[PDB]
């Protein structure tokens, strides 16, 4: 709502990410009576140009990727004093640079003295943020010596402003669901995120990422905290992150000694997708013919407090799955009686990605003259990316950006399975599944051993 | 299921209510291959006809009022020698003569000696069964000295074997709705039975009954017992009736010193119904032009035990209402935290007469950018008389017929209002209402003074 | 407070079970103005005596077994025609003969019309009442064809009516103990009845009973029903029996298929009890030198309803144990969290035979710089005959100390699988013997230790 | 737990508090094997006598006060130049001169650069810390502009370390007391702190302090926060304060509009105490003979969350009460079924001041032949000031010292009451009570109008 006028600058040379995506996003929101006309988006890169030789570059991508129809200070990074060469006195910095450029790029910026104000300047950083627990802790120390915890924005994932608020109003404004969210009535919970695309062109990035560093830490660890936290005192941005952090300090893997009851991996083979054949992962361009690089990942978690004792959590994600979905399923206990010999347990679902809504399933009597029960259903549908982030940066509200406290608390949970999986091994014992199959056969025994089974989505 | 050969001895099957109703029902039951082809019907009345007259009367009654295409013996009712004049030996009697001829008939039939077989003879009694607590108690003594416990069937109301069983499975086979069925989460309950037609040709009977002996004691007191009972150990006939009695022994009117916070009566006058004008109750034929008989009744009860303490119950019934419905509505409390703005409390209703199914209401976020809530709905439909009464009497089912303990226990709670409303008073202080209006204006203040409102159907 | 005038007809065989046990009680309480002196005791037996010989015999025992300082009838039991021609019209009957006689002695009583009144005749019976499920139903059928429901009194275990009312007030008058009395907070329950005496001199009744028809069915099944029943509407006599019956219909033995996880038996041998060399079981007079009658018995039951689902119950009883106690112990769950600074479960007990009182154990911090925990407790004590009160209530009618006809047949059903298996002949060298002075036969310890628990030391 | 060696820099030691009270405590600690042998104490004052005259004030302050049997300077107070005249590299300051010299002293001490690294020096501030909400927020800004947290310790009151741990272990290590600690079973809570002494010689301080700024913001707020707080994740210095702050953000005075149902005040007069006459408040030296300072206060608060919704809290404190007692009492509800005759509700107490322990009252049957209940009791006793405060500062701990958030949050709650009693009024409207009487007669209607009574300690 009416962001204050400021000046924006860019880093990281002239990569196509900003010009084709970020610049059109600002232009699109400009013609909507949202941003003030006084913006003066100052450009900056690592290549010689002129003030007019790059103005047409914006038009080269705006109409080529969007609906269609500014000062250049290019210098030289290879000098320890280049920053000295560089409205209402406001600034916003961008760090669209290589992963190995942040510690160089923040130290000299702090030494310059531009980031010496609490309100005028802010700095944002690009994903990823470290590669393990040790690498993130060291990077957090450099940030703390140049800035405060009010001007740093980390872009890890985008869940949506309207998706978080839809869940908070459902649990905390109804007197019929909260008493049932505890260990006395719930049996187990399941979380699933599915995809139908393989690595298309990002073969150079996914090779060193895997499926635990890509989606498990960022995405599935944020849907898990929303369905297991305590009621906050307010919806204020810093009143929810405290409750989200508090629940991450009681979370642990189910088994630590034997890392086979709390984790499986996989990698997809050749198969049939959408009526056409598709190649295997190892035969794709840019991929080494003998690599592990997990694509599937299933984990089991436990929480130790007065509310969630004895209730396990199951997390599943992967690529080349039959369909694209995202869901949370809560299953209750069996009825404490048997006068109805005939009773399947009750399930409450929360659909997210395909069609937002709420479902509830229970048991009803089958018409006739003999006591038999069936299963019925109830439904409710609400309907019947970069645009939101930049607005929140301009206003200055930080609820889509993770704090520096919970970044290092999610790296600690997945530490054992990680350190087990980066260890080199024989490139012939990796479980495989066809492109179009829900899961490898090894992941079916993880849940079936407890007497349960996965959900057919 | 299959009945057994026997013989009927319907008393006074010459006047009415037998030739046009009982005989067609038995004929249609036999036509559908339900009753075994070994059955005899014998009339017993104060007439001097022959068999052929009975056959022609039965044929005329069946053809006139049903789809279409046995002996007789005269007898008196005031002489022991008369009964001396009167398959496999089984016998089932039927007493439908008059509301003054039950005790002589029962006493003489018991004295003569036909009703002396525990497993071979049964007796049924027509509605009503007594008029006060003392009048009902006296009739039980005569029955107790001539009859056994499993030989008496009392016909007062009809609910159907499918409506009772559809409600037991929903409650006791689900692990969600039982924890919320107590005083810690429920606010109040409401029960409503409405009708659109009243006193067509039964002005003689309705003058001495009123809407307290006609519907409140029989019908509305059986829907109230199923909503407040404890889970039984089985679905046996004896296992369920033992939990309905235990609830009626802890029920009392809310106010006993002042009979104005726990009871309201009314009567209907001229108005518009179905686009046509209708006459008033006092100007209807066969009715005294200064009558003081109520066609409306609202009460408030309280149950005092470990589960239903502090939760009131509201009961309402009447005639010439705008609609024909029957419902039970359970409303829950309000959420403690007020961090949300607009919060209507949740409700859960079970429709019966209007439609059979379940209704639910909760709160969901209004789309946009401001925190506003909007109430939504969930639905489920199951679909999309005097014929089962005669079937369960042939076999041994103690469910559709009330016991001897509930009859004298339902007459006790309504005693304070029965005595006060029966005393003579001037015929100018009755709260009249129009034909087509939900309730008298005096009934609005009974619930409004507590901070609530009558549900609008 | 005071009963009504009546006429009594005690004695059925003129044995040594009434002269020094029953009539002294009436005489003793006649001196305290408890009941009016408007009764005439009538003696009925198969022997021939005089009106003074009976009085002399009664005096021979009244002063020799009590505090010290009655028309007799003769004939035969099988021919009561002469006896029929004997205060208002009130009678109370008594039976003190062999079990095989109850049907002969109760079938002919109703034939003569002596029992043709609702509230003027009582037909109290001795113990036992049947020997198995099928034998009790047959006796119930004969009773139902002569007398009414509120006319039959069955002599059984004695609780005193003061212990029963002590638990009802404790449970149902406090708003601090009922919320925790369900499956969400309780781990398991234990019930124990101990004794320090052998078979004494009977040796003829215990040889055909064992410790399954002697204490388990009668005594231990009534302490179990009071601990697992739902609140009643009133403290009325017939309003508590309904709740007691409703619990026995959902009770079953765990592991019915394999009868080794739900029952152990035992017998005691020679040992030291009070510094003396107590002899073994198969050495006392009147006992066969090779017998397989149980003396110890442990069982495990499980209730299946909305409140007690998943909570097991443990029952233990025996003879020649080191001390005489009776107790009920309730153990709660562990705290759903671990104390953290960089825990034994709580028990609630209820003593009966050893002492009438309450106990409660919890955890407190140890004094010092560290935060180690202790096990502190809190206490409370109430204080800090049988055939004299069980007999004086038949004159007025109790309906509380005497069991009904439903629970009698319902308690015989749960213990049926273990009663049949233990009756089949078996090698008389595999009985789990134990020393006279120890608790368990060392094979009942694995019954509970297998689940991860332990018996209470007591 | 041995403190690290350091150099003490006591500020303003010329007063009658350091050498009389603080120095003997340090001496006694040094006699034991706790304090390190390398501890240098530096004296600061306003006057200049000699370098050895400071060593003779010790002889008159220790040899005759505690147990029987070092530098100096003459720096100014407000002068930048004067501070230039001023083991290991460790120091600890002790600022206690007056309640109006904290800002300039702190500013001039921080200007010289004596606080420039995380852990080399600590500053402790003597009570009081602010007078109103506005006067306490400004002092926090000055502190944050010179140093950071973890380096400042505020002395407000003294609650023993054993008492807090004794309270925490009892609540959170038992499985029978937590389920009953919520709104479904509790009626109300009472907290009481009583004394038996007057103003003594501190007539100059109590005149401008009152009974609202003493023991109602410091003492009674800490006892209230330990009873209404949620279980912490782990027992830690900064894990209990987070849960204590979260509770103070929900409390509020009941009936804010009318400040007479949420607060009473009083003042004592002449009476009998220990068999000896005692003077009234306005008859003692140094007190104005027409003062309106309260020596009594009773409040009523309410917490608004999912746990304490609808449960009031009653706070009471005063002077010249008959006995010295501190206690917390919790009273539960009444049993629904009323088939038992007399049922007083159960109470659970926690004695603190006279002797620590636990009590519990319940109902047992009175022996006899008729049904009548009794009241019994169960007990447990644990046994059967300026010493630790001078140790946690040297060792380094933040458990006995309040935080910055809690100081400004306790001042907000009592703001409406504080701002109303401060207004001028006629001296003849002050409630009065005798010296030896519990409460003024006006304070007995605050609780009796709800159908309750104060406890009879």
PDB file of C-alpha atoms in Angstrom, chain D residues 244-380:
ATOM      1  CA  UNK D 244       7.026 -15.005  31.321  1.00  0.00           C
ATOM      2  CA  UNK D 245       6.921 -12.133  28.812  1.00  0.00           C
ATOM      3  CA  UNK D 246       4.290 -13.935  26.719  1.00  0.00           C
ATOM      4  CA  UNK D 247       1.899 -13.922  29.699  1.00  0.00           C
ATOM      5  CA  UNK D 248       2.200 -10.222  30.589  1.00  0.00           C
ATOM      6  CA  UNK D 249       1.070  -9.367  27.037  1.00  0.00           C
ATOM      7  CA  UNK D 250      -2.412 -10.805  27.692  1.00  0.00           C
ATOM      8  CA  UNK D 251      -3.283  -9.610  31.208  1.00  0.00           C
ATOM      9  CA  UNK D 252      -5.402  -6.519  31.815  1.00  0.00           C
ATOM     10  CA  UNK D 253      -7.324  -4.911  34.651  1.00  0.00           C
ATOM     11  CA  UNK D 254     -10.957  -6.006  34.720  1.00  0.00           C
ATOM     12  CA  UNK D 255     -13.566  -3.266  34.210  1.00  0.00           C
ATOM     13  CA  UNK D 256     -11.180  -0.576  33.005  1.00  0.00           C
ATOM     14  CA  UNK D 257     -13.948   2.020  32.612  1.00  0.00           C
ATOM     15  CA  UNK D 258     -14.895   2.113  36.316  1.00  0.00           C
ATOM     16  CA  UNK D 259     -11.769   2.051  38.495  1.00  0.00           C
ATOM     17  CA  UNK D 260     -13.637   0.880  41.593  1.00  0.00           C
ATOM     18  CA  UNK D 261     -14.247  -2.802  40.766  1.00  0.00           C
ATOM     19  CA  UNK D 262     -10.515  -3.344  40.156  1.00  0.00           C
ATOM     20  CA  UNK D 263      -8.681  -1.489  42.928  1.00  0.00           C
ATOM     21  CA  UNK D 264      -8.824  -0.406  46.577  1.00  0.00           C
ATOM     22  CA  UNK D 265      -6.351   1.555  48.701  1.00  0.00           C
ATOM     23  CA  UNK D 266      -5.880   2.101  52.413  1.00  0.00           C
ATOM     24  CA  UNK D 267      -3.794   3.589  55.198  1.00  0.00           C
ATOM     25  CA  UNK D 268      -3.325   2.439  58.772  1.00  0.00           C
ATOM     26  CA  UNK D 269      -3.965   4.340  62.000  1.00  0.00           C
ATOM     27  CA  UNK D 270      -3.256   3.906  65.715  1.00  0.00           C
ATOM     28  CA  UNK D 271      -3.830   0.460  67.148  1.00  0.00           C
ATOM     29  CA  UNK D 272      -2.487  -2.493  69.107  1.00  0.00           C
ATOM     30  CA  UNK D 273       0.531  -4.490  67.917  1.00  0.00           C
ATOM     31  CA  UNK D 274       2.252  -7.109  70.062  1.00  0.00           C
ATOM     32  CA  UNK D 275       0.594  -5.824  73.217  1.00  0.00           C
ATOM     33  CA  UNK D 276       2.085  -2.359  72.671  1.00  0.00           C
ATOM     34  CA  UNK D 277       0.530   0.847  71.321  1.00  0.00           C
ATOM     35  CA  UNK D 278       1.709   1.903  67.872  1.00  0.00           C
ATOM     36  CA  UNK D 279       1.344   5.337  66.226  1.00  0.00           C
ATOM     37  CA  UNK D 280      -0.627   6.117  63.103  1.00  0.00           C
ATOM     38  CA  UNK D 281       0.814   6.848  59.686  1.00  0.00           C
ATOM     39  CA  UNK D 282       0.446  10.634  59.948  1.00  0.00           C
ATOM     40  CA  UNK D 283       1.977  10.760  63.424  1.00  0.00           C
ATOM     41  CA  UNK D 284       5.541   9.502  62.625  1.00  0.00           C
ATOM     42  CA  UNK D 285       8.604  11.683  61.953  1.00  0.00           C
ATOM     43  CA  UNK D 286       9.155  12.883  58.404  1.00  0.00           C
ATOM     44  CA  UNK D 287       5.554  12.299  57.257  1.00  0.00           C
ATOM     45  CA  UNK D 288       3.264  15.167  56.297  1.00  0.00           C
ATOM     46  CA  UNK D 289       0.258  15.261  58.673  1.00  0.00           C
ATOM     47  CA  UNK D 290      -2.121  15.301  55.686  1.00  0.00           C
ATOM     48  CA  UNK D 291      -0.560  12.687  53.411  1.00  0.00           C
ATOM     49  CA  UNK D 292      -2.525  10.488  51.000  1.00  0.00           C
ATOM     50  CA  UNK D 293       0.071   7.759  50.422  1.00  0.00           C
ATOM     51  CA  UNK D 294      -1.359   4.212  50.348  1.00  0.00           C
ATOM     52  CA  UNK D 295       0.086   1.383  52.429  1.00  0.00           C
ATOM     53  CA  UNK D 296      -2.377  -1.148  50.983  1.00  0.00           C
ATOM     54  CA  UNK D 297      -3.481  -2.293  47.540  1.00  0.00           C
ATOM     55  CA  UNK D 298      -5.877  -4.901  46.147  1.00  0.00           C
ATOM     56  CA  UNK D 299      -6.240  -5.499  42.401  1.00  0.00           C
ATOM     57  CA  UNK D 300      -8.031  -7.893  40.048  1.00  0.00           C
ATOM     58  CA  UNK D 301      -6.576  -8.994  36.701  1.00  0.00           C
ATOM     59  CA  UNK D 302      -7.744 -11.218  33.854  1.00  0.00           C
ATOM     60  CA  UNK D 303      -5.789 -13.212  31.257  1.00  0.00           C
ATOM     61  CA  UNK D 304      -7.214 -13.752  27.751  1.00  0.00           C
ATOM     62  CA  UNK D 305      -5.938 -16.861  25.960  1.00  0.00           C
ATOM     63  CA  UNK D 306      -6.947 -20.473  25.323  1.00  0.00           C
ATOM     64  CA  UNK D 307      -5.951 -21.556  28.860  1.00  0.00           C
ATOM     65  CA  UNK D 308      -7.041 -18.860  31.356  1.00  0.00           C
ATOM     66  CA  UNK D 309     -10.226 -17.639  29.648  1.00  0.00           C
ATOM     67  CA  UNK D 310     -12.681 -16.510  32.321  1.00  0.00           C
ATOM     68  CA  UNK D 311     -10.577 -17.092  35.464  1.00  0.00           C
ATOM     69  CA  UNK D 312      -9.946 -13.997  37.633  1.00  0.00           C
ATOM     70  CA  UNK D 313      -6.892 -13.350  39.791  1.00  0.00           C
ATOM     71  CA  UNK D 314      -6.927 -11.497  43.124  1.00  0.00           C
ATOM     72  CA  UNK D 315      -3.828  -9.737  44.475  1.00  0.00           C
ATOM     73  CA  UNK D 316      -3.467  -8.335  47.990  1.00  0.00           C
ATOM     74  CA  UNK D 317      -0.618  -6.666  49.878  1.00  0.00           C
ATOM     75  CA  UNK D 318      -0.252  -4.340  52.831  1.00  0.00           C
ATOM     76  CA  UNK D 319       1.612  -3.259  55.941  1.00  0.00           C
ATOM     77  CA  UNK D 320       0.990  -3.624  59.684  1.00  0.00           C
ATOM     78  CA  UNK D 321      -0.989  -6.823  59.131  1.00  0.00           C
ATOM     79  CA  UNK D 322      -1.356  -9.166  62.131  1.00  0.00           C
ATOM     80  CA  UNK D 323       1.172 -11.693  60.788  1.00  0.00           C
ATOM     81  CA  UNK D 324       3.868 -12.112  58.138  1.00  0.00           C
ATOM     82  CA  UNK D 325       2.655 -14.589  55.506  1.00  0.00           C
ATOM     83  CA  UNK D 326       3.033 -15.241  51.775  1.00  0.00           C
ATOM     84  CA  UNK D 327       0.940 -17.854  49.993  1.00  0.00           C
ATOM     85  CA  UNK D 328      -0.648 -18.840  46.672  1.00  0.00           C
ATOM     86  CA  UNK D 329      -4.058 -20.542  46.761  1.00  0.00           C
ATOM     87  CA  UNK D 330      -5.931 -22.282  43.929  1.00  0.00           C
ATOM     88  CA  UNK D 331      -9.607 -23.220  44.313  1.00  0.00           C
ATOM     89  CA  UNK D 332     -11.404 -25.675  42.031  1.00  0.00           C
ATOM     90  CA  UNK D 333     -15.018 -26.021  40.894  1.00  0.00           C
ATOM     91  CA  UNK D 334     -17.946 -27.877  42.491  1.00  0.00           C
ATOM     92  CA  UNK D 335     -19.004 -31.410  41.574  1.00  0.00           C
ATOM     93  CA  UNK D 336     -22.049 -31.542  39.243  1.00  0.00           C
ATOM     94  CA  UNK D 337     -24.002 -34.317  40.953  1.00  0.00           C
ATOM     95  CA  UNK D 338     -25.579 -33.057  44.183  1.00  0.00           C
ATOM     96  CA  UNK D 339     -26.593 -36.391  45.731  1.00  0.00           C
ATOM     97  CA  UNK D 340     -24.189 -35.758  48.636  1.00  0.00           C
ATOM     98  CA  UNK D 341     -25.080 -33.585  51.617  1.00  0.00           C
ATOM     99  CA  UNK D 342     -22.818 -31.417  53.773  1.00  0.00           C
ATOM    100  CA  UNK D 343     -19.591 -29.889  49.779  1.00  0.00           C
ATOM    101  CA  UNK D 344     -16.877 -27.250  50.051  1.00  0.00           C
ATOM    102  CA  UNK D 345     -14.603 -26.929  46.994  1.00  0.00           C
ATOM    103  CA  UNK D 346     -11.058 -28.253  47.106  1.00  0.00           C
ATOM    104  CA  UNK D 347      -8.119 -25.893  47.648  1.00  0.00           C
ATOM    105  CA  UNK D 348      -4.424 -26.348  46.828  1.00  0.00           C
ATOM    106  CA  UNK D 349      -1.950 -24.083  48.622  1.00  0.00           C
ATOM    107  CA  UNK D 350       1.760 -23.285  48.245  1.00  0.00           C
ATOM    108  CA  UNK D 351       3.265 -21.690  51.352  1.00  0.00           C
ATOM    109  CA  UNK D 352       6.356 -19.576  50.713  1.00  0.00           C
ATOM    110  CA  UNK D 353       7.491 -17.142  53.400  1.00  0.00           C
ATOM    111  CA  UNK D 354       7.045 -18.687  56.899  1.00  0.00           C
ATOM    112  CA  UNK D 355       7.961 -22.221  55.847  1.00  0.00           C
ATOM    113  CA  UNK D 356       7.801 -23.761  52.389  1.00  0.00           C
ATOM    114  CA  UNK D 357       5.573 -26.727  51.689  1.00  0.00           C
ATOM    115  CA  UNK D 358       2.415 -28.034  50.059  1.00  0.00           C
ATOM    116  CA  UNK D 359      -1.138 -28.503  51.343  1.00  0.00           C
ATOM    117  CA  UNK D 360      -4.234 -30.167  49.906  1.00  0.00           C
ATOM    118  CA  UNK D 361      -7.815 -30.197  51.203  1.00  0.00           C
ATOM    119  CA  UNK D 362     -10.494 -32.710  50.224  1.00  0.00           C
ATOM    120  CA  UNK D 363     -13.681 -34.264  51.600  1.00  0.00           C
ATOM    121  CA  UNK D 364     -14.075 -37.536  53.504  1.00  0.00           C
ATOM    122  CA  UNK D 365     -17.068 -39.241  55.083  1.00  0.00           C
ATOM    123  CA  UNK D 366     -17.755 -38.553  58.757  1.00  0.00           C
ATOM    124  CA  UNK D 367     -17.958 -41.902  60.593  1.00  0.00           C
ATOM    125  CA  UNK D 368     -21.348 -43.024  61.838  1.00  0.00           C
ATOM    126  CA  UNK D 369     -24.526 -44.438  60.333  1.00  0.00           C
ATOM    127  CA  UNK D 370     -25.748 -41.478  58.237  1.00  0.00           C
ATOM    128  CA  UNK D 371     -24.244 -39.800  55.182  1.00  0.00           C
ATOM    129  CA  UNK D 372     -22.320 -36.674  56.192  1.00  0.00           C
ATOM    130  CA  UNK D 373     -19.052 -35.342  54.785  1.00  0.00           C
ATOM    131  CA  UNK D 374     -16.037 -33.844  56.555  1.00  0.00           C
ATOM    132  CA  UNK D 375     -13.029 -31.732  55.565  1.00  0.00           C
ATOM    133  CA  UNK D 376      -9.532 -33.191  55.917  1.00  0.00           C
ATOM    134  CA  UNK D 377      -6.026 -32.080  55.013  1.00  0.00           C
ATOM    135  CA  UNK D 378      -2.674 -33.379  53.749  1.00  0.00           C
ATOM    136  CA  UNK D 379       0.677 -31.684  54.351  1.00  0.00           C
ATOM    137  CA  UNK D 380       4.325 -31.786  53.306  1.00  0.00           C
TER     138      UNK D 380
END
